[PDB]
Each structure stands twice: as C-alpha cells, then as structure tokens.
Design a binder for this molecule. Structure first.
Ligand SMILES: CN(CC[C@H](N)C(=O)O)C[C@H]1O[C@@H](n2cnc3c(N)ncnc32)[C@H](O)[C@@H]1O
Length: 252
C-alpha cells in the first residue's frame, strides 16, 4: 500500500498515547473503536479490561472476531450503539476512556456534543483520562488559506456557499486513499469542547500536533519506532499525518 508509513505513524502515535496514560490493570472504554486495532496495543499495555463501543455494527463485528482470535489477558466487552448522540450508561466507570479518530463525529450538533461529553464524564473515574486524536481545525483552515487541501493520499473540501464566513464552516468532506470517501467530518469546536468539559469536571492536560508528538516520542522511544518501520516520512505523507492533533482531558 501507498499509505503504510501513514498507518504505521498513526498507530505509533496511538501506541505512544496509550503507553502514556495507561497502567497495568486499567479499565478502558474505547469509543468509536472501529475494527478494534488498538486491542494489541492495550494488550502490550497490560490493561485488565477493554470495553469497545461503536455505532457501526459492522465494525464491532471485526473487533469481536479480533478479540476472539488474539492472545490477550484482559476481559473484553462490546456494544454497537451511538456513544455521542444518544445517552449511554454502561453501568461502570473506567480509568481511561479513549476516542481515536472519531470524537469529532460528536460535533454534529450542539445537543450532540453535550450528550457525548456527558457520556464521557459519567463513565470516567475521578482522576481518569480521556485521550483522543482528532483532526485539527486550525490546521485545516490554514491549509485552506494556502489553497492546498490535497495531494496523492488525501483531499479535503470545505462546504461553504457564497456570502459565508470561513470561521462559520462547521463541516467538510474528507477522502483518504484506501479509506474513507467524501466522508463528512464535523470540525472540532475546541473552545466549546474545553468549556463543556470544564463544567463536567474534566480539564485539558494535553494538546500537541501529530508531527511534533510523532517527532518527540520518536526521539524518546526509538525502540518502539524500529518495531514498525518508523524512521521517517515523506512530505506528502506528513501532510496527512499533519492533519491530526492529540488532546487529553482529565477528570479532576
Ligand atoms: C476512524 N474510525 C475509528 C478507528 C479506530 N478508533 C482506530 O483508532 O483505528 C471511526 C469510527 O467512528 C465510529 N463512529 C462514528 N460516529 C459514531 C458515534 N456517534 N458513536 C460511536 N461511534 C461512532 C464509526 O462507526 C467508525 O468506526
């Protein structure tokens, strides 16, 4: 594939994120879990329990199979439901709630983000963490102003008719080689997210771009790097990976 380095970079960053906020025996609530790729990662992390939730039944299906045919130590749970736009009560708290490449889908509407943030807060143990990897609105708009919103690997189209402020835009279409097609994404209203979380007892403790994060952790953990071809990136690739940022909140 032409997206291998990108995939490896993203998994690495994700692996480092997990490594940074999870301790042995932790309980993890993976939201928008998808096919459950992070299962192997949580395994190396020695977590005690893993709960996977995704609105797409088709995704949960692959996650189940995955958890079923893998050498794992933690207990596993799965549920196919909307964890952002519909009330959720799994009946227990977690040490770490993870949303990898999907919490932005929680910004469809004002009410939607509210439910989502409230769903994260009621399932998070005091002191627990909410780790995430969301697309950066600042980045996307700046690239917008550069008139360069694509290349071989991806493409982004902002939805804005005549007489419409740029800052007014709340969604765009995203396409990634060997992945989503004209997939609609909602911009992360950072300030609204932060505030909303502050009222629920969660405060921001981290926010860094994928390239710097990639670079930093890379110069501080060369071992896991080599363990997956991680050793550099082209400019085209870096632009895809450059789209995202790491954001962590903590229930204080
Ligand atoms: C990029 N997919 C996650 C991959 C996985 N988290 C990873 O890190 O590899 C995004 C997932 O978001 C999920 N999703 C979208 N909207 C919602 C929602 N409202 N509630 C739960 N999951 C959602 C989709 O079903 C999709 O599987």
């Amino acid at each position: 594939s032409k997206t291998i380095n990108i995939r490896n970079a993203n998994n690495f960053i994700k692996a480092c994120l997990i490594r940074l906020y999870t301790k042995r025996g932790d309980s993890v609530l993976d939201l928008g879990c998808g096919k459950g790729g992070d299962l192997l990662k949580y395994e190396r992390a020695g977590i005690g329990e893993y709960y996977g939730v995704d609105i797409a039944e088709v995704s949960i299906n692959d996650a189940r199979v995955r958890a079923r045919n893998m050498k794992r130590r933690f207990k596993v749970f799965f549920r196919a439901q909307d964890s952002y736009g519909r009330h959720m009560d799994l009946g227990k708290e977690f040490d770490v709630i993870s949303s990898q490449f999907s919490f932005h889908y929680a910004f469809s509407t004002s009410e939607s983000l509210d439910i989502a943030q409230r769903n994260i807060a009621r399932h998070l143990r005091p002191g627990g963490y909410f780790i995430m990897t969301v697309p950066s609105r600042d980045v996307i708009l700046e690239r917008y102003k550069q008139g360069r919103m694509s290349n071989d690997f991806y493409k982004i189209e902002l939805e804005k008719m005549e007489d419409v402020p740029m800052e007014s835009v709340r969604e765009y279409r995203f396409t990634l080689l060997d992945s989503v097609n004209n997939c609609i994404e909602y911009f992360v209203d950072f300030t609204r997210m932060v505030d909303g979380f502050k009222r629920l007892g969660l405060s921001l403790v981290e926010r860094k771009g994928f390239i710097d994060f990639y670079e930093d952790e890379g110069r501080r953990n060369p071992e896991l790097s080599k363990k997956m071809g991680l050793g550099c990136l082209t400019r085209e690739e870096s632009e895809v990976v450059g789209i995202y940022e790491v954001v962590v909140f903590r229930k204080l």
